[PDB]
């Protein structure tokens, strides 16, 4: 109904500095730096102090106001990405054929290969996005860990690995074989 003013608050830790200009957001923390372009929402950022930043929408409808809370979540994710980081864990699930997962290098591109998925002779390759590191956890059988500063880069990288191992022409309720995300958390 064209609300006069809607407001959200963003908190900043001690070691994190935020620079916003022309809807370009750069967050610098102990773990690195992140940059995001937000020139598609028409919001107004204002600084209260070194520990608080407010973002507001003026004369906005229901749909416009709904995007204001999204901005806060995206900026908050950047802040914790450069402070605590993100760690995604996945597990290998299979019935008969073991799944062999290894990291390979192809023309300096840092791919990851999946072998012997349901006995397939085909080799499945998934690119590893920049800023995402892949390690194989010890003392836990068939687990792969993805870490990085950007939650979107880590989440999408893990999602690509899950979709590359989908079963075709079979009852998926019976053939529960694949690699699935099992835990979402922070590196620290």
């Amino acid at each position: 109904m064209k609300y006069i003013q809607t407001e959200q608050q963003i908190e900043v830790p001690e070691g994190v500095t935020v620079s916003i200009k022309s809807r370009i957001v750069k967050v610098v923390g102990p773990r690195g730096t992140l940059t995001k372009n937000l020139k598609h929402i028409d919001v107004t950022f204002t600084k209260v102090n070194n520990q608080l930043i407010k973002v507001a929408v003026h004369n906005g409808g229901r749909k416009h106001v709904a995007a204001l809370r999204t901005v806060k979540s995206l900026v908050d994710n950047m802040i914790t990405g450069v402070t605590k980081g993100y760690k995604y864990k996945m597990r290998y699930v299979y019935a008969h054929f073991p799944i062999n997962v290894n990291i390979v290098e192809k023309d300096g591109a840092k791919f990851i290969e999946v072998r012997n998925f349901l006995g397939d002779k085909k080799i499945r390759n998934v690119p590893v996005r920049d800023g995402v590191t892949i390690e194989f956890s010890t003392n836990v059988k068939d687990e792969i860990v993805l870490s990085g500063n950007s939650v979107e880069d880590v989440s999408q990288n893990a999602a690509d690995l899950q979709q590359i191992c989908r079963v075709r022409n079979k009852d998926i309720r019976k053939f529960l074989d694949g690699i699935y995300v099992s835990h979402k958390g922070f590196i620290t």
Partner: protein, 171 residues
Amino acid sequence: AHFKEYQVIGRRLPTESVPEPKLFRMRIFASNEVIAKSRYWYFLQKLHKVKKASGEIVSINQINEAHPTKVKNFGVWVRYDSRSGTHNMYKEIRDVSRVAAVETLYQDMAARHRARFRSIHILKVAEIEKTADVKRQYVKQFLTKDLKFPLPHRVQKSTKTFSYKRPSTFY
């Protein structure tokens, strides 16, 4: 059109059995007196056994706003006919005069419910004297202390076809 509020007073034609019949008054929003008298007989024929041929108009007077430069909160009760059925509706309008609030009411009904003038009956227009009696959120948001708001993205009207610099929307 630009509405004016008239008071119209009417009566039945006096006879030998009942000399001096009762006087009936009602307040009508209309653009002129000719329409105001027409609307008077329209509502009187819905309430009493009388019509224009068997009655007469006693007096018609325009009513002005007592304080036309004071911001007031109005509560309006209306009855209107939609494409299927008749409904009652309560709306709240903020303005400086009754005629101004009624003009907004007709525009609002046409825009949101496609209701023309002929399909609307104004049951009552009353000023809301006290705060916290306003029950619509689209009116209450203007009743906060020290209200301030900017006007982002100003658009300026140009009198010439061509401009020699890129324009700015600052304000």
